[PDB]
């Protein structure tokens with residue numbers, strides 16, 4: 001059951017700008033998504049300080065990076081607070097109208113794209129390396145949903161009947177551009193994490209698939 005929605009115009013504008021930019025330091029996308037994951041984990045930790053049972057849906061707090069070489073997909077999963085269906089529509093398709101406009105104005109003045117996080121819209125940096133994204137999310141007391149975008153003007157939200165259960169949290173599935181496949185490689189991912197994400201309160205786990213010989 002696929003619900004189609006339209007992006008706020010200025011979010012559409014910024015996705016188009018990012019997906020087309022030729023910026024040469026695209027690895028900063030991973031810092032931004034890890035920072036979003038850490039923020040989500042902060043929120044469930046805050047709730048769990050009052051009510052520890054909120055952790056029981058997924059007791060381990062983590063950020064996990066899962067390259068899917070066969071699919072040309074990079075997944076970034078967290079066990080943070082997650083997003084409801086209404087959140088997905090609101091958080092990703094509408095709110096952040098302010099940050100997107102201020103950031104585009106800053107770009108026109110000469111700002112570096114790596115400053116995107118300071119306007120609160122670092123999520124959209126994923127379009128530096130991906131042309132399509134699914135956001136799978138599960139909030140306590142709500143169902144698991146999938147939000148899907150191709151940087152155009154429409155997104156969809158669907159009850160998730162096809163992905164692994166998250167327990168609680170969010171998984172971004174980045175469909176990488178054909179010239180950005182370096183970010184499926186263990187060595188490259190490690191380099192970028194160590195360079196830009198040294199001060200993160202949660203374990204950053206990398207899933208590596210190796211042949212037994």
Ligand SMILES: Oc1ccc(Sc2ccc(O)cc2)cc1
Pocket residue numbers: 033036037039040043078080081082083123170172
């Ligand atoms: O204040 C909040 C509330 C929910 C989240 S969920 C999430 C969203 C995007 C993302 O790239 C990773 C996780 C994050 C911060």
